[model samples]
Target: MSRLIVVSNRVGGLAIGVLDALKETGGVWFGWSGETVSEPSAPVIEKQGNVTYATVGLTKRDYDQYYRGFSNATLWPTFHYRNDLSRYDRQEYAGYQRVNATLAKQLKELLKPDDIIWVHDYHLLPFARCLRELGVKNPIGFFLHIPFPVPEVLRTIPPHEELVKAMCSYDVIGFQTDADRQSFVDFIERGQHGTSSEDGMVHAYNRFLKVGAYPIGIYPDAIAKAAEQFTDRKPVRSLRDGMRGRKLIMSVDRLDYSKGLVERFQAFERLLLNAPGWHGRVSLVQIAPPTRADVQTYQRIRQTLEGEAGRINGRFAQLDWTPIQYLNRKYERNLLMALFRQSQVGYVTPLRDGMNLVAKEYVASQDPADPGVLVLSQFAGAAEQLPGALVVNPFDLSQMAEALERALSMPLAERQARHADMMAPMRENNLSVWRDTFLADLRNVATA
Candidate 1:
């Protein structure tokens, strides 16, 4: 078997799917060690069974400029369609390119000629080009785990042209949805005046770039089994005890602008105000873990969510009941699965996402006999696969509010019907299948 080389921003934990794939394929995983050292170090390779975990530490300057400044402050917001929040500086871009080149050099030292390189996310968009510049000839694939904006939105970045050119260096580029793939192909064809085939191949930047949609799914069976084991655990039991027979409307998302968290809070408030009868009968428990806290925009989002949650609770709280139980913390997966199983409604209304796995996780964690209702956002990539969900336009505040009210009151039979339909695709298109399909397609594209 040819060795698979996986590269990304951070080294561990987040790439569980890729790690599993790499282990199965007998490969090496290279990435940042999530620690800042005095200077860049040699690759630290550790062998475990068939897979090798190779990591390198970054310098403080490189970590700040490339990771905090460019990756999070610039590319993250720009790609998420939040241009106003994106920060751009020439030095930041320079730092990003320099870091990619450095990572490519490190990877090249460990790579064999037959290795298949798989770069991941916006953080390493320029990595393939960096590898090419380093005189490494190998099959390289890239997968963006975020929504790719249309040409107009993409152009807001000063280095948009260069970025697209760098992206074309990949053998195959994958997106989470057809809409994202269409946006990329449209940009290459119309914006850059490149030639593209109907079969998702684009000839641009002097490279034959193959682009396609590959929606990602969660491990449904594992999540279901975990829910069964952890549903009655102490943390979940404590949550259930606090509810006192009231229906639990649950939401779990990272505290980020892209999550539509403010809108979620507003809609929940609307649900309380409009459906007054549900004053004490229902409660929304929003778990928003803080991420990228150093970013100013994220700080503001946290403040806004806290203020909004406080205002709603202040208005609706009786002596015995508080309508919104907002928590800003992270929970372990097992406990989270237990929480998902206990809820009557799952509100996953993101403004935009590549594929919100939380939506699938919520469905997978449901008790088939007494399943919960899923109120999903139409803009989420998972919406295409989960047609049975109560999909609503998150921007339409009143519509989401109405959907939440309806979801809370949805009968057991209808909830089970919708849940059962959504469960089928969740079980079918699991993470392993997604990984296998992408690898197979990437290999085909490379050989072609």
Candidate 2:
């Protein structure tokens, strides 16, 4: 088997799907060592069984400009369709290029002739091009685990043309949904006026690139097994006991502008006002752990959500009940699954997402006999797969509130039917299938 060389912004703590793929393929995982050194040195490598871990540290300048500046403030928001939030600087873009070139230099030293390289996420868009510049010829692929904006949005970036050209360096470029794939294709054809083919390949910058939608999935069987074990744990038990007779509405996400947390809070508030019957009967447990706190936009979002949650509770709370129990902390994975199992409704309403895995995990953790309703966002990529979910536009507060009220009142039979519909797809398109399909396609395309 040809070795699988996986590269991302950071090396450790990969998603379960990616980890499973690397283990099965028996190769190397390479990326930043998650450390900033005053003076950079050689790549640090460690071997465990069939897999090798290769990591390199970034200089403080590179960390600031390449990571915190260009990657987060600029590309991240732009890709997620948040042009208003995107911040740009030519220096940051230059740093981004330099960092990619540095990573490529490190990776090329560790590459084997037959190794198939898969670069991940927007943080490393220029990586494959850097590799080509370094004369490292391997079967290279890229998977953007976020929404690809339309040509109009893409053009907002300072050097949008250069970025798109860099992306075309990959043999196979993958997106989370058909919409995202089309966005890239449209950018090539409309923005650059380049020719595109029906075979999911785009021709631009004198390069041919294969692009496709490969929706990622969770390891349903494994996650379900973990959920079963979590049921007996004290944390799960305590949450169930505290809910009393009230139904639980759960939302778990990192605190970010793209999550639509403020809109969700507003809708929940509307639910309390519009549906008085649900008063003291339903509780929303939102776990939004702080992320990118240094970013001014993120700080403002946090404050807004905090104030909204406080206002809702102030207005709606009875003597013994709080309408929204907002937490800004992380929870263990198994505990989260257990909470997913206990909830009467799973509220995964992101403004825009690559593929909301929490939606799938919520469905997987359901008790088939008495499953909960999932009120998902129409903009989320998961919406395409979860046909039975109560999909709504997150921006429409009234519509979302109505959906929540309906989900709260949904009959057990209907909930079970919806859960059943979502479960088969989750089980069939498990993470292993997602991983293998992408890898297989990359191998085939490279060999051709």
Candidate 3:
């Protein structure tokens, strides 16, 4: 097999996704080494069995401007239809360009003939373009692991032209859902006057790029196996015990503004006010570990979230148990997985997401015979595959609150049927399928 080189901003999820499935597929994961030093340097390489990792480090200034400034503050929000939040300083753009050039230079050094380069997320959109400029002819693919903003929103971006031009460097570009794919296609069409092909791709700027929706799914069998293995754990047992008669509603996400923690709390609070007799009967456990605390927007969102949670608990909590248990820390994966299984309802409501893995993880951890209901946010990329979930608009608090009540009050048979419907697709198109499908599609368009 030809070796695959995967690049990204930081390597955690991308590495896990590829390594977990293609452990013996002769691939090297490439990205930042997660350390900010005083100077620019190529990544330190370490090999394990058939897999290898190549890590590069950035100076603190480069890390801030390239990663924190341009990637997160600019491209992330702009691409997700949150232009108001986007910060597009010229220096940040220059940092972004420098980072891309650095990535291209590093990859150029390590690249072999026919090495398929699959770069992940908004951070490295320009890297492939830089590679192309450097005359690397290997088939390159770019995958956006988040929501692609609508064309109307894409226009609001300051350096939109540069970014769009950079995207054309890839032979194939993939999105998480048909909606996001269309959003990209639409952007190309409206902005650049590109023509859309019948097969879900767009031809633009003298280049033919394959754009398609490859909705990501979870490994249902693995989660089921995990749930079975740790069924006796205390947290799971304690949660199950606590949820003896009442229904348990659970949501787990990083404490980022994008996850809509405040909006979700308000919705649950609305449920307490509007839904009859649900105060003492229903319990919500929201696991939101703090993330990006340095970002001013994230900090503001955190303060707002805490205030909202406090208001809800004060208004709705009974003498014995609070209506909501707001956890501000991360938990071990297995422990969280078991907690997801024990709950009667899984609440995954993100305002915007590339793909929420928690949704997939919930499906994986369920008991097939009596699976729990998943109240998901329609805005989430995972909702494309898990349509049977009680989908809601996180922006609409009333609708979301009602959906939560309905999900909890939903019958066991209905929940079982929905979970079955949801789990079937995940079983077929799990992480392995995603890796294979994406790599295979990349091979079809670009030579490796």
Candidate 4:
């Protein structure tokens, strides 16, 4: 069997699918070591059975420009269709490309001819191109975990031409939804005047590759088992005490502008105002852990959330009940699923998302006897699969409030039906399936 080399921007917590793939194929997982050093040092390698964990730290400048600057300020915003928030800096773009080459340089040292390389997410669009520049030949693939912007939005970046061309260097490209896949094909065909061929391949910038929507998913059965086995810990007991039998409306999102969190908070407040009787009957627990804190834009969101949460509590202050339980922290994964199990509503209303795995997680973590309601955002790619979700336009406050009202009052019969409907896809097209399909397609692709 050919070794599967999974390359991501950073080595964080284990993504179960990626770990399973690596364990099965017996290969190296390469990326940043989740640390920063003064200069490019040798990769820290740890071998566990068949899998080799290879991680390298970045320099301050590399971390700043490649990660914080271009990846976040450019691709993250632009891909989410937030062109207003996106920025273009020549230095950052240079750093981005430079970091790709540096990563490729490190990866090349551990290359095996039989290994197939699969890169994850937008941070490394030029990774395969860099490897090709290094005269390495192997089946290379990339999966975009965020929404791919339309050609018009891509045009906002000055380096779009080169980036698109570099992206074409991969043998296969995976997207979260057909919309995102279509957007990429649209850029290739209309924006760059590239042509399509048989077998889902596109001929663009002197390269041939297949593009498809794999729609990444979570391991629902495992999530369900975890939720089932959850024991009442400190946080869980504390939350129960605070709720005092009131229903919980749970939402967990990264502290980013795209989450529509501010709108969500406003909508929760609207629900309290519109339905006076339910003021203390339900409370929202918004878990928004910080990310990219150094960025000016991120700081503003935290400030706004803090002020809004304080005001809402102040206005709806009760001696025995709190209106909102806004937590800017994260819990353990299993604990999170346990928390989801206790909640009456799962509010996942991102402005735009690739596939909110949390949405599926919520569905998986429910008590089937009295399953919780999911009020999903229409713009979320997960919404396409979860047709039973109480879909709402996050931009519309009225719609948000109405969805909340309906979700909080959802009947057991309806909840079971919705849960069953959503679980159909969860069991069918899960994380393992997604990873396998992408690798299978990547393996069969014809090179340029």
Candidate 5:
């Protein structure tokens, strides 16, 4: 049987999905363990159910440079359309290259004759490039799990040439949206001064990299099943009862600046002030699970969000009803579904995102008879697919407030129509499709 090897900076949600697919197809999952201790090491193995995972440990310096430094500080913000906030530093750029080199070296060692190496995300862009240097020929494909910045903004980033050059090392480059794919092609044509075709793929520096849009969707069926679990269903009623007859406006996101958690709260606060009677009649539930909390940026974001949430509740919340019920913790799939089911509107308005799975989950968890409206961010990767969503620019305070009110007041027929249109696509482009599509593309590319 052909074996697939998956490599990424950290084994995150998408990586976990890749690992599960590899287990079913019979392969190895290799990447950093998200643990930085001692000297940088390579290829440590662990097992989850039927899959085998090979993880490496990095040093503190590597972590600062690769993860907290370049990946999050530079690439993440810039790629996700927050170029204004991107932290561009020459040292961080060097760190990114070194870590990618280290990942590449590990790929060279663990690779087998029939092994198809499928690298995931920005941290491993140079993996295939380094593998080619070792004269190891096998199929290698790379998928960027975040939004790709437009060339005009992307050019401002330091060492932009080096990063773009490394990207050409992949056989197939997958993006979250057509615009995302165009962003890369735009950079190639404008920044690298290369040629881009109308198809949105580019021949840059020296490689013929195939760029394509493969927007990801959630596992609706899996989510639906998870929603029905007694463990999850019990909480739905409990939360709904807790709200009594008050309307619920909800959002679930990682506590990062890109999520616009503070803006969301401000908008809700506006809702309370403008629509006075609506104050005790409705509430907002913001479920923000912690992510990259160890980093300074994350730390600041958390403090700011918590402070804002407190200020809002202190001002608007009455003894009977809290304006914003903020939960700074993660709920398992089941529990999160329960919360989604109870909400009158799913307000997933990220400033930027690779894809907002919570928005998809919200749709899957709704009752078709009376589904909640989805107030989504236009910048979210999912917005490209779930087009029926009430897309909003989370940055616009007035617009956000207006969108929230509109969604909350949407007629049942309009809500059901929107939900039904979105659910149809989500049903087919489910987790299984994501698993098969990425892995299938990974296998198609042959390393030479």
Candidate 6:
């Protein structure tokens, strides 16, 4: 068996995925150390069990230009179909390319000929090209954790030309949904005038590469187990009791623009103003912890949400009840699972997502006997796997409001059926399956 090498910007979600894989097949995990140094030190190597941890620190310039500027300002917004908000700078793109090359130089020394390299996310899209330039012939794979914009939207990206040619250097690549994968191929064909062959290969930039939809997953059984354990905890019980017999509508998202936080708040406001008899009977419990606080758009979204939540509560609050209990903070994981289990509905309506893990977590956290209805955004990648959710377009405020009303009043039998439908795919395609399948494909790829 070839040793697996996982390369990503951070040791978080992708690192977590590799933790299980590395244990199964002893390998190496290399990435940023989540710290900044005056200058990057030599690779800080640590070893445990069969896995070796190789991390490097970044300078402030790398953090700003590589991470904050090009990755977030350029690729993130364009990839998420927010071209209107995207900003591109030549210097940032230079830093982006420089950082990728810098990381690859460190990674090359740690490489073995038989290792299968898995590079992750938009931040490092050109990583394989960098490694290839260093003369590493290892089978490299890239998995995008965000939407691949259609050609029209993607063309607005200033460095799409360089980025596209660079990424095709990978042996195989993966997307979170079929939609995302198709959009990727669409770019190659329509934007670059390349051909997509029937064998799931894109013939582009004189390179042949395999691609597939490998939607990332949470450990459902684990979440189900923890949820059951926390369901009876005091915090969970307190929220339930505080509801005072009202049906609890729940939402949990990081305060990001892509989540449609402002629109979600608008929809809730519409539900109150347009829908009668729902006031005071059903309360929304939204947990939106702040993220990307430095971004002006994030700041704007936060202020808009706070204003909406405040205005709605001021208009709808009774002597003892508030309609929207917006908590702009995060809770512990265990507490969140418990809260998900207790809620009567899960309203996860992101404008765009690679895969809304929260949607899957929401389904897994529910009690099978009495599962809550999931009102999901149609654009969310999870909407494909989770037909059990009440799918609605986040752009449509009336549709968003109507779904909540439907979810709150949904028949118990109907809720159970929908939950069952969603759980089938959730169980069949889990974290292990997703990880293994992608690795297997990368290992099996042949040069054309």
The residue ranges of model 1 lying beyond 4 angstroms of the native Cα positions read 12-14, 446-448
Worst 10 residues of 1 by lDDT: 8-17
lDDT of 2 by residue, 1-448 (tens): 8889999877712446577667777889999989999998899889877788999999999999999999999999998899898999999889999999998998899998899999999999999999999987788899999999988898999898898888888989999999999888888887665688767877888887788999998877677777888899897889898899999999999998899998998999999889899899999999998698998888999999999999999999999999999988988898788889999999999999999999999988888888899999998899978879999999899999999999999998899899988988888887778888889878986665
Can you write out model 5's per-residue Cα lDDT over 1-448, one digit (the tens) per residue? 5677887766537754676668766778777888878876557777777777778888899888888888888888887667777887778778777877777777677667988777778766677787877786777778888877777777778777767787787777888778888778777776655787544446777776677877777777676666656334666778867989788998888888888889999988877777787878888988888788887878888998889988999998788888888887877767778677778899998888888888998988887788889999888888867868998888887888888899889999999899889988998887778767866666655533
Q: Write the per-residue lDDT of candidate 4 for residues 124-149, one digit (tens) a residue.
A: 99999999999988999999999999
- In candidate 4, stretches whose alpha carbon ends up further than 4 angstroms from where it belongs are 12-14, 446-448
Q: Output the lDDT of residue 116, model 3.
A: 85
User: TM-scores for all candidates?
Assistant: 0.98, 0.98, 0.95, 0.97, 0.92, 0.97
Better of 2 and 3 by TM-score: 2
Clashes of 2: 0
Q: Runs in model 2 with CA error above 4 Å?
A: none
lDDT of 6 by residue, 1-77 (tens): 77889888775356567788887778888998878899668998899988989999999999899999999998998
Q: lDDT score, residue 55, model 4?
A: 95
Q: Worst ten-residue run, lDDT, model 6?
A: 9-18
Which lDDT value does model 3 have at 230?
82
RMSD of each predicted structure: 1.3, 1.3, 1.9, 1.6, 2.4, 1.5
Clashing pairs in 4: none
What stretches of model 3 exceed 4 Å from their correct place? 20-22, 242-244, 446-448
> If both were scored by lDDT, which would come out higher, candidate 5 or candidate 6?
6
Instruction: Tell me which of candidates 1 and 5 scores higher on lDDT.
Output: 1
